[PDB]
Structures are given as structure tokens and as C-alpha cells.
PDB file of N, CA and C in Angstrom:
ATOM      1  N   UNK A   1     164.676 127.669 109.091  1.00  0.00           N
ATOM      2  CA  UNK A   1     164.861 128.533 110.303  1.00  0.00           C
ATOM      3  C   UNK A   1     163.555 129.283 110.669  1.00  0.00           C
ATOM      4  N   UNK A   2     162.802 129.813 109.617  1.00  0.00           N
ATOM      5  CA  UNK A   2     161.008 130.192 110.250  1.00  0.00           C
ATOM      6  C   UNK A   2     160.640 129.108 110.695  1.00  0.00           C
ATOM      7  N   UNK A   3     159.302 129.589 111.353  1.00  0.00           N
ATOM      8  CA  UNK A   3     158.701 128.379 111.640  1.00  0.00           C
ATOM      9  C   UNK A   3     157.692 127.655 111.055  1.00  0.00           C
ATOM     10  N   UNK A   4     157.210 126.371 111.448  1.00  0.00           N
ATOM     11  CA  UNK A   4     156.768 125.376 110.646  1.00  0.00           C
ATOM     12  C   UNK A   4     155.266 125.261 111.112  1.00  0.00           C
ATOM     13  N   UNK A   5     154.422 126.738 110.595  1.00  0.00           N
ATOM     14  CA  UNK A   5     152.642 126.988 110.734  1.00  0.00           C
ATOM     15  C   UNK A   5     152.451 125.433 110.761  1.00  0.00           C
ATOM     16  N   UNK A   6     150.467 125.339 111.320  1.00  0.00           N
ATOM     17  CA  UNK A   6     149.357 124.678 111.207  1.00  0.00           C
ATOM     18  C   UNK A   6     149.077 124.613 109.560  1.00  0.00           C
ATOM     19  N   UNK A   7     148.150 123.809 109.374  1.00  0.00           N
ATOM     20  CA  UNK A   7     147.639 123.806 108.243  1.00  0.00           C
ATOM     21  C   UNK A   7     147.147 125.493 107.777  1.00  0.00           C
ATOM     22  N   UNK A   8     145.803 125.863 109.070  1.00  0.00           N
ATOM     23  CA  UNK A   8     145.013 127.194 108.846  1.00  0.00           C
ATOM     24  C   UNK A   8     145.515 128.694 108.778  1.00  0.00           C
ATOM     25  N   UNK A   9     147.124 128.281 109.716  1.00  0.00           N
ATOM     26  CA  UNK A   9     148.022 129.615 109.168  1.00  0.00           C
ATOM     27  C   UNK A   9     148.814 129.488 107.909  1.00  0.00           C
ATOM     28  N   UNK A  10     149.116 128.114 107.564  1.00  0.00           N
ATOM     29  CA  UNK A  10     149.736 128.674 106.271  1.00  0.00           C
ATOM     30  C   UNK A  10     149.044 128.979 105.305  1.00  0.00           C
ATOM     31  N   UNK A  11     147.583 128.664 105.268  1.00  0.00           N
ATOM     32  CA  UNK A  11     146.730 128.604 104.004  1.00  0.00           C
ATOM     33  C   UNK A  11     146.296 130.528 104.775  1.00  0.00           C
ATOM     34  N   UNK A  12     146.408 131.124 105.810  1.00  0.00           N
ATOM     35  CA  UNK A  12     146.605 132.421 105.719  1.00  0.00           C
ATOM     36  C   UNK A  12     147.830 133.500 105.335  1.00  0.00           C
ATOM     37  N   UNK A  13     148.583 132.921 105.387  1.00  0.00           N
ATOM     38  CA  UNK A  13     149.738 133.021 104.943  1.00  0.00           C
ATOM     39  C   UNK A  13     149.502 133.449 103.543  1.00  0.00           C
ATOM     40  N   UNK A  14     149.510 132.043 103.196  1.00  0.00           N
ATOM     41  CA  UNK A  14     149.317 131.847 101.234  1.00  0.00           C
ATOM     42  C   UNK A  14     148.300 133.043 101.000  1.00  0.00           C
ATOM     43  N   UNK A  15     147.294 133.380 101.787  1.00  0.00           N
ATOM     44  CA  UNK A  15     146.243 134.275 101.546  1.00  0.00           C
ATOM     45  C   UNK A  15     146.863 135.874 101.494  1.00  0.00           C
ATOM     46  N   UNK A  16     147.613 136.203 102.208  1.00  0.00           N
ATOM     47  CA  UNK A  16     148.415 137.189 102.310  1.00  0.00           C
ATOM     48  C   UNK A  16     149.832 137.504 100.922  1.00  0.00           C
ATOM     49  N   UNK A  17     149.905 136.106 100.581  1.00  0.00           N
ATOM     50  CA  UNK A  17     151.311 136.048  99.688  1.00  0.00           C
ATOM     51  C   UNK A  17     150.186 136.619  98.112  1.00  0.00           C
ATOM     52  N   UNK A  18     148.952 135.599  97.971  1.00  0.00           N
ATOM     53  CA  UNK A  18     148.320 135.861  97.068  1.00  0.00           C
ATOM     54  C   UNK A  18     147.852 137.347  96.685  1.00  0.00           C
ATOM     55  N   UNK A  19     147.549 137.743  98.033  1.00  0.00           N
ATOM     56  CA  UNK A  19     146.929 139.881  97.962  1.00  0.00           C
ATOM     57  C   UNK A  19     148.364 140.431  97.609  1.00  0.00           C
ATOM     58  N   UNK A  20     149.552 139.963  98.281  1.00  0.00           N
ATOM     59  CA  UNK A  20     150.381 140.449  97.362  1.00  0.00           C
ATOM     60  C   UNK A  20     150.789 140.845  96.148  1.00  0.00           C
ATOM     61  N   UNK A  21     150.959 139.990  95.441  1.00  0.00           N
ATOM     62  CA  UNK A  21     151.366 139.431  94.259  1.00  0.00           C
ATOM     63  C   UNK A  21     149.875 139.885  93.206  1.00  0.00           C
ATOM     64  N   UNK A  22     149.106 139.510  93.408  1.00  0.00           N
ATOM     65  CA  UNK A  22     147.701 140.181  92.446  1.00  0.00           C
ATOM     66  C   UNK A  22     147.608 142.096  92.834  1.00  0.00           C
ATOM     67  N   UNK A  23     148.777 142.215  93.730  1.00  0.00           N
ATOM     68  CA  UNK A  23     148.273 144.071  93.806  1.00  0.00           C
ATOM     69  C   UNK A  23     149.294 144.535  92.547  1.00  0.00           C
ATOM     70  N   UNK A  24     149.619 143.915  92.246  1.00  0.00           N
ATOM     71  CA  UNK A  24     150.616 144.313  91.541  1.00  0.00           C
ATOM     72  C   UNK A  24     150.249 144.024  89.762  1.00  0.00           C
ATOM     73  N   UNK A  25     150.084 144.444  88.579  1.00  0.00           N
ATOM     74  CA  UNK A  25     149.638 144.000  87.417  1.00  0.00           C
ATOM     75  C   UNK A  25     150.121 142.260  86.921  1.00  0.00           C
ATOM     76  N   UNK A  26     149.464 141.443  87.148  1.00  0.00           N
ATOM     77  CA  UNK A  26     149.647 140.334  87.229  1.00  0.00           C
ATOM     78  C   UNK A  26     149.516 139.265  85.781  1.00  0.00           C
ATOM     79  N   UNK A  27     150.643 138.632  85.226  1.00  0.00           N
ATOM     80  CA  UNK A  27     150.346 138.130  83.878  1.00  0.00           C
ATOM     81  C   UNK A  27     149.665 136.723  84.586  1.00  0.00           C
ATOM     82  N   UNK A  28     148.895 135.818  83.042  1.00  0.00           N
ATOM     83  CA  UNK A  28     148.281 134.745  83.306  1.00  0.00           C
ATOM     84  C   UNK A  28     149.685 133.972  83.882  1.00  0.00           C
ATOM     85  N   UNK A  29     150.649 133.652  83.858  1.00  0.00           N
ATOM     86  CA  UNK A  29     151.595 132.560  83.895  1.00  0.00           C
ATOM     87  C   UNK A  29     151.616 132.888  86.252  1.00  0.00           C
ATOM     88  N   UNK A  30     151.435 134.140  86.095  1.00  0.00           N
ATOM     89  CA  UNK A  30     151.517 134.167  87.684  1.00  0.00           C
ATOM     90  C   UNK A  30     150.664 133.399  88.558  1.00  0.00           C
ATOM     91  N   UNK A  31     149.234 133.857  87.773  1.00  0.00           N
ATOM     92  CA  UNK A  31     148.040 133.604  88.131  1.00  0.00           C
ATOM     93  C   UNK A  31     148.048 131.895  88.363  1.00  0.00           C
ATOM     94  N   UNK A  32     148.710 131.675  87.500  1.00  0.00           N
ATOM     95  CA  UNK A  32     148.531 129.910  86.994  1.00  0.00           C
ATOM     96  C   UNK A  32     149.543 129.779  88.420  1.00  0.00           C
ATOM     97  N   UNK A  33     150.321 130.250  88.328  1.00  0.00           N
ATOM     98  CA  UNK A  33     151.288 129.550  89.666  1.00  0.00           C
ATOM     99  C   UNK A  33     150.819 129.796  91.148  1.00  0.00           C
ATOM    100  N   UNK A  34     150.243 130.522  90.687  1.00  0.00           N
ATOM    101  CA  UNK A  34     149.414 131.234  92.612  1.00  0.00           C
ATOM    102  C   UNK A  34     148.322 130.008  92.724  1.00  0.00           C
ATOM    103  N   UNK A  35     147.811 129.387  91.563  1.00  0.00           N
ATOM    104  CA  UNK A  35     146.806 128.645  91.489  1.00  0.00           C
ATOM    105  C   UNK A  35     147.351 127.122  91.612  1.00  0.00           C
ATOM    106  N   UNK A  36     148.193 127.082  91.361  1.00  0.00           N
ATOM    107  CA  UNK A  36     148.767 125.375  91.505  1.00  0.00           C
ATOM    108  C   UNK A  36     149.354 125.649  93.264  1.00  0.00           C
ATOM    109  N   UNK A  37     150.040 126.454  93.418  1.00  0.00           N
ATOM    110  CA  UNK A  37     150.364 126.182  94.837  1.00  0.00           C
ATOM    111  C   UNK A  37     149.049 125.746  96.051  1.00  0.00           C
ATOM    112  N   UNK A  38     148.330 126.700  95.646  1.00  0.00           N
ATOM    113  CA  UNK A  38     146.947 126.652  96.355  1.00  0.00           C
ATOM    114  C   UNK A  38     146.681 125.223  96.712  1.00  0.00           C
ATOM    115  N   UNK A  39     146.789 124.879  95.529  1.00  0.00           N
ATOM    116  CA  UNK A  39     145.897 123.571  95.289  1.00  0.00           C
ATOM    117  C   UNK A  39     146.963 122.528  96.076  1.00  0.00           C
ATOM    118  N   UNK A  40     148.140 122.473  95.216  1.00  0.00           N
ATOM    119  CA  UNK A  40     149.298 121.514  96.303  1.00  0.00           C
ATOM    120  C   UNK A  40     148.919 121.938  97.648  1.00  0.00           C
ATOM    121  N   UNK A  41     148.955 122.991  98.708  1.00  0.00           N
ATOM    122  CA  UNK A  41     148.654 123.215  99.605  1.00  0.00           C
ATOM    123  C   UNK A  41     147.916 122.425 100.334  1.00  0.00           C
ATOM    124  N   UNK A  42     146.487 122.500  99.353  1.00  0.00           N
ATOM    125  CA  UNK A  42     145.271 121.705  99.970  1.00  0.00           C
ATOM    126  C   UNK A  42     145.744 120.513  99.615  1.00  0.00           C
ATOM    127  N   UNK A  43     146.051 120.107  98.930  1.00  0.00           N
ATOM    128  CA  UNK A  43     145.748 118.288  98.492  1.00  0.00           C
ATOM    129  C   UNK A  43     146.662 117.457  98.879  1.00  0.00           C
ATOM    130  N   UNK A  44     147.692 118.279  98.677  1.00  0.00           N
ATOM    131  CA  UNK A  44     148.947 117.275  99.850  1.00  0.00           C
ATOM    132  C   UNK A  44     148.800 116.934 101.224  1.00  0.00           C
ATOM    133  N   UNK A  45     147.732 118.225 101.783  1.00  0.00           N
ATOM    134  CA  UNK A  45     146.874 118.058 102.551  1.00  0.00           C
ATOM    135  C   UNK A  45     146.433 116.859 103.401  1.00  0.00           C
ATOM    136  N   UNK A  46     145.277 117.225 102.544  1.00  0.00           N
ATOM    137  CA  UNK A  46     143.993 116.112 102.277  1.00  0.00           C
ATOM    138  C   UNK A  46     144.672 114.623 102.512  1.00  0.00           C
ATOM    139  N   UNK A  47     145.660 114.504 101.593  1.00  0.00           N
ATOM    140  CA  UNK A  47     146.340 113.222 101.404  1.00  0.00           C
ATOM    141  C   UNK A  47     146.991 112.761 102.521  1.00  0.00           C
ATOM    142  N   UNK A  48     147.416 113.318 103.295  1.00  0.00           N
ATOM    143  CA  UNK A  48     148.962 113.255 104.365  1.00  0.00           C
ATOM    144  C   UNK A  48     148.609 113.500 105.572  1.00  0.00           C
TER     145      UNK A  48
ATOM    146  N   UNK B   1     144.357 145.691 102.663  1.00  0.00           N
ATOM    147  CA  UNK B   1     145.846 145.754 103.444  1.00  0.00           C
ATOM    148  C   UNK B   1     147.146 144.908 102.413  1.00  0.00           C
ATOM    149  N   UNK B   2     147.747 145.686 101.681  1.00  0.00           N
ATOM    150  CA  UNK B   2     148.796 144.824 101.222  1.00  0.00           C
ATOM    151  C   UNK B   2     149.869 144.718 101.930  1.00  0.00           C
ATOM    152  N   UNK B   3     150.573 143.451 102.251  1.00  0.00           N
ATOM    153  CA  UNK B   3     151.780 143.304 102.758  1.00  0.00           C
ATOM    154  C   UNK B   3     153.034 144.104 102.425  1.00  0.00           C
ATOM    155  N   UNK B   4     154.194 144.415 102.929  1.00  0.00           N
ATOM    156  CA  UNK B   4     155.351 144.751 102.279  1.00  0.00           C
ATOM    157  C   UNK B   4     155.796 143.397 101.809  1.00  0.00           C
ATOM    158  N   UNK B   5     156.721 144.250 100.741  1.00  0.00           N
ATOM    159  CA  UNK B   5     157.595 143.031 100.053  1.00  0.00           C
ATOM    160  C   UNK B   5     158.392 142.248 101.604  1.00  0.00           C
ATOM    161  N   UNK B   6     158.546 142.859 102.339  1.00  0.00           N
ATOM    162  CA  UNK B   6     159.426 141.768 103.390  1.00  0.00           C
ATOM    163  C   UNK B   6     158.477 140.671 103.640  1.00  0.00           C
ATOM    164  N   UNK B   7     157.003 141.246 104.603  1.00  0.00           N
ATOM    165  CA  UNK B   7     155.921 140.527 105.163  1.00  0.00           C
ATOM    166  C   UNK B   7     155.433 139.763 104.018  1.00  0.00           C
ATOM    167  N   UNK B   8     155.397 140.271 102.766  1.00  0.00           N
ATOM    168  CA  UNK B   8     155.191 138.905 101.626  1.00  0.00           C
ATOM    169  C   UNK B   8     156.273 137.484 101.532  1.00  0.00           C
ATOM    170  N   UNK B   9     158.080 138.123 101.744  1.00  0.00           N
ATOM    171  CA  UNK B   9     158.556 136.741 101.919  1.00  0.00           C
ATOM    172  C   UNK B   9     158.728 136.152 103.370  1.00  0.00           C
ATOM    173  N   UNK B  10     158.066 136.921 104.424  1.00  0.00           N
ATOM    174  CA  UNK B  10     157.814 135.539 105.377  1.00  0.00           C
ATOM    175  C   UNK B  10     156.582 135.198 105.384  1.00  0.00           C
ATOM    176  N   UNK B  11     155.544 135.446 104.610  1.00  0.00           N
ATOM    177  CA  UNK B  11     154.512 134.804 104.519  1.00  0.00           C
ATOM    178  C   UNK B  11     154.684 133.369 103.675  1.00  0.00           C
ATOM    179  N   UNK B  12     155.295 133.964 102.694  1.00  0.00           N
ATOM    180  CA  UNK B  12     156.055 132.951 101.945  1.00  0.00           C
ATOM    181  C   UNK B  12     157.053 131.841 102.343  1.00  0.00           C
ATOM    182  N   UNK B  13     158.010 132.323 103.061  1.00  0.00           N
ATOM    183  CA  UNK B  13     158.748 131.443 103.786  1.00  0.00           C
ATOM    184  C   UNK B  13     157.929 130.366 104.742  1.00  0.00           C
ATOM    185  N   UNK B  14     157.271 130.820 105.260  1.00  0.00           N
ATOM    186  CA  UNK B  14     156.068 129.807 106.053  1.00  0.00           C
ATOM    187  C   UNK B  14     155.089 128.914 105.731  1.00  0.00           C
ATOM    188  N   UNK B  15     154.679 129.620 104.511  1.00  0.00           N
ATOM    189  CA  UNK B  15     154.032 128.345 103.478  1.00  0.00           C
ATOM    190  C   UNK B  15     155.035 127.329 103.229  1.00  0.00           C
ATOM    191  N   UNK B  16     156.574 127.925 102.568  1.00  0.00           N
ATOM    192  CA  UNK B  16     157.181 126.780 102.207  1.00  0.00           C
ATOM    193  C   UNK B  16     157.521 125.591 103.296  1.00  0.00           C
ATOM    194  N   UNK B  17     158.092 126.395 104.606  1.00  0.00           N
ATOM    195  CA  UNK B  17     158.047 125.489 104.979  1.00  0.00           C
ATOM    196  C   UNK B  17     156.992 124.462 106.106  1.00  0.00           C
ATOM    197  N   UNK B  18     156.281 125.033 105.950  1.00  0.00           N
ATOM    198  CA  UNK B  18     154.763 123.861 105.910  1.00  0.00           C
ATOM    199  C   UNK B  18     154.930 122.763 104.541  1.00  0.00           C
ATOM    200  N   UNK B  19     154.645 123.469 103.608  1.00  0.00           N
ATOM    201  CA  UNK B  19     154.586 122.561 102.839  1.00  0.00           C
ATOM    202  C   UNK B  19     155.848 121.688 102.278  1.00  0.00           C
ATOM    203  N   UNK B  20     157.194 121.691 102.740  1.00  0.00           N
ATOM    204  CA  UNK B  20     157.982 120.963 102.870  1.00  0.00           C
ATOM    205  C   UNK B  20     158.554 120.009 103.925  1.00  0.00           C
ATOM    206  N   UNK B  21     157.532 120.137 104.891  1.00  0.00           N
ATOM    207  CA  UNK B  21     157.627 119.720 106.227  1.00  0.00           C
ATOM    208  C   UNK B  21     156.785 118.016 105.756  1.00  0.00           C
ATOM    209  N   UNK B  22     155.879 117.965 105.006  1.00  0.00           N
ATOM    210  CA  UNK B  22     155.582 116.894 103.999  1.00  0.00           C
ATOM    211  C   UNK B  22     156.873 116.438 103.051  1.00  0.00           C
ATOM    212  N   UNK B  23     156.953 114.843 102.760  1.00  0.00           N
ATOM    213  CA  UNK B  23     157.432 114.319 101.436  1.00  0.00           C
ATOM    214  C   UNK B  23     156.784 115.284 100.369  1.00  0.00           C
ATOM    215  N   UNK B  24     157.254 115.805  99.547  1.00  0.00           N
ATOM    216  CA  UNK B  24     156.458 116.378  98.073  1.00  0.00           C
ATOM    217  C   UNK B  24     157.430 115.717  97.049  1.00  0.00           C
ATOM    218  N   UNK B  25     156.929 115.874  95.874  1.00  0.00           N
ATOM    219  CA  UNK B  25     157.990 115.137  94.929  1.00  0.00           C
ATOM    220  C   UNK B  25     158.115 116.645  94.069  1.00  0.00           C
ATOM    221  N   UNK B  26     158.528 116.275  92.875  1.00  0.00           N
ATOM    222  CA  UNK B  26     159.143 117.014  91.788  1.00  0.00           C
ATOM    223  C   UNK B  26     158.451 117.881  91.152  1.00  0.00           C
ATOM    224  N   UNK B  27     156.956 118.005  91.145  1.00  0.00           N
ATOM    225  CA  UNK B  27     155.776 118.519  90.520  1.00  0.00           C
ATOM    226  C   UNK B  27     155.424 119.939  92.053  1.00  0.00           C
ATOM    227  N   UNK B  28     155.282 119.532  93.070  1.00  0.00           N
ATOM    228  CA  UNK B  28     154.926 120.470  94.066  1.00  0.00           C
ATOM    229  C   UNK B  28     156.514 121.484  94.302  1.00  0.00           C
ATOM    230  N   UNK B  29     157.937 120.467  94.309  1.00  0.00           N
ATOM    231  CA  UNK B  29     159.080 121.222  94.190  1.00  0.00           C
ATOM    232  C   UNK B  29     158.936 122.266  93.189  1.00  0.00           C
ATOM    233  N   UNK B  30     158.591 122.245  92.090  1.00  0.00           N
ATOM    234  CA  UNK B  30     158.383 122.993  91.019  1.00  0.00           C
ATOM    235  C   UNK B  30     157.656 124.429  91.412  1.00  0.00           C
ATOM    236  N   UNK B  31     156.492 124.014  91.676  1.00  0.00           N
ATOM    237  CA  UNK B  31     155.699 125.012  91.972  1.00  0.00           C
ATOM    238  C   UNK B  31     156.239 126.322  93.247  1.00  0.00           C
ATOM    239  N   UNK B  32     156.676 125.531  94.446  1.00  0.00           N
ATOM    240  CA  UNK B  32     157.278 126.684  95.393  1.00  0.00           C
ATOM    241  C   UNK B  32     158.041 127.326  94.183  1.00  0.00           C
ATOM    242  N   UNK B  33     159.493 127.117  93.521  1.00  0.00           N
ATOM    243  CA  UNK B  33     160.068 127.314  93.134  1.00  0.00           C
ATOM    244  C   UNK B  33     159.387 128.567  92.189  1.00  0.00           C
ATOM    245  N   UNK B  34     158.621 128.351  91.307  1.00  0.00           N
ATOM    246  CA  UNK B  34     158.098 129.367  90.324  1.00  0.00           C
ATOM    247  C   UNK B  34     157.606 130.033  90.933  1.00  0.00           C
ATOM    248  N   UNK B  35     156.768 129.716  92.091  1.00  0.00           N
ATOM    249  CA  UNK B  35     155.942 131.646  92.723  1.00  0.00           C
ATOM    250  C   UNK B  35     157.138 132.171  94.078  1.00  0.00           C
ATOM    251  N   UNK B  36     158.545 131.458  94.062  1.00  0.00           N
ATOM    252  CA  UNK B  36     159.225 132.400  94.840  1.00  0.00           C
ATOM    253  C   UNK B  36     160.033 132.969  93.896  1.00  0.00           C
ATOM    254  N   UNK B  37     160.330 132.365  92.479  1.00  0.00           N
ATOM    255  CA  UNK B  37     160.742 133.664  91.456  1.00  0.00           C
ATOM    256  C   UNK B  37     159.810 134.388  91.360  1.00  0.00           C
ATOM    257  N   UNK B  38     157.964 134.685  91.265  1.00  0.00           N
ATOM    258  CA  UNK B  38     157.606 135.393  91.229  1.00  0.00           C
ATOM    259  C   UNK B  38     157.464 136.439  91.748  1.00  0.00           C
ATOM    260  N   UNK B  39     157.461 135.977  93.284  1.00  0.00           N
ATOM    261  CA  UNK B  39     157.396 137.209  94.179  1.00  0.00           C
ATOM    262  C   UNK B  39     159.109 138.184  94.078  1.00  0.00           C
ATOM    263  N   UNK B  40     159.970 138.076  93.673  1.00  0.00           N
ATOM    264  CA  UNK B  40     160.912 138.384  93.931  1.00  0.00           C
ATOM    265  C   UNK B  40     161.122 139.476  92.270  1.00  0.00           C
ATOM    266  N   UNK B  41     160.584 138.704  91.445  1.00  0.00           N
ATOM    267  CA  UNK B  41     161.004 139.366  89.691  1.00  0.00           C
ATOM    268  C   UNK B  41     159.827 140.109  89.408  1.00  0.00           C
ATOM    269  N   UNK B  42     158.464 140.227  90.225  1.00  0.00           N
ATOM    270  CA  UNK B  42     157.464 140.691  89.901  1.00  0.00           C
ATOM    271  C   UNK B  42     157.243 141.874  90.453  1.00  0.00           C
ATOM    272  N   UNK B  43     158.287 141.695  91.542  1.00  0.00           N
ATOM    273  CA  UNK B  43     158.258 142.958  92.418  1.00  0.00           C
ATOM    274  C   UNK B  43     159.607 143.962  91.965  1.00  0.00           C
ATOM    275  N   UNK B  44     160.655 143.403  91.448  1.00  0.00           N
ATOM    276  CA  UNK B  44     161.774 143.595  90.651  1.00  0.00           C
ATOM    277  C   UNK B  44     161.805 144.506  89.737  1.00  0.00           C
ATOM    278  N   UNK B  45     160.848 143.609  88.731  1.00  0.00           N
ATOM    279  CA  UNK B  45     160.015 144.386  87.557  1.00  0.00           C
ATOM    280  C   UNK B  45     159.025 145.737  87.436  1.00  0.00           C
ATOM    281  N   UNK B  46     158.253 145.847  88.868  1.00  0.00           N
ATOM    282  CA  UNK B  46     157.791 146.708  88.735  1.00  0.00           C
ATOM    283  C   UNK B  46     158.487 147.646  89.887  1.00  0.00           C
TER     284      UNK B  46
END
């Protein structure tokens, strides 16, 4: 039912979800997941 | 500028669905899945 961003808003988006989530005391297991999405983001990307 | 917890899950909501707007398989399913428990138990938690 939201809507379905460009590539350059969701990767602002994600940029916004990330300042989130790191304002807050952040364990490695978060970090690791903020970091794989990123990457799916881009590379599914790239690919598709 | 930090978001509110709301403006964090439609930032969130919009990534997902971008990135489900693609085929993904079981490995990228995974991943939404773990950082939308995060945002939700991290913010919970503290």
C-alpha cells in the first residue's frame, strides 16, 4: 500500500532508516544487518 | 536529523517495497525480515 520509490529514493530512504537505528546504542548483529540490506539493495540492483 | 520511530517505518516500508517489487529469493527475504525486527525491538528495548 506505500509506494514503490526509484532506485535513488530508496537507497535515501535506507539512508534515513540507517541514521536511525545507529542513533540508538547499536550491537554488531544490527550493524551486520544494516550492512547486508545495503548491499542486497545495490546488487539486486545492478543485476535486474 | 534523526527520524521518528514512525518516519523510520515508512522509510522502511519503502525500501521494502522497492526491493520486493524485484524477484528476491530466500537470502534477501531474510534480511528485510531481520532489520524490520530491528527497528521495532531496538527501539522497544531502549
Amino acid at each position: 500500500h506505500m509506494p514503490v520509490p526509484s532506485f535513488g529514493e530508496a537507497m535515501a530512504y535506507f539512508a534515513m532508516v540507517k541514521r536511525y537505528l545507529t542513533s540508538f546504542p547499536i550491537d554488531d548483529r544490527v550493524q551486520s544487518h544494516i550492512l547486508h540490506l545495503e548491499h542486497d539493495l545495490v546488487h539486486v540492483t545492478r543485476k535486474n
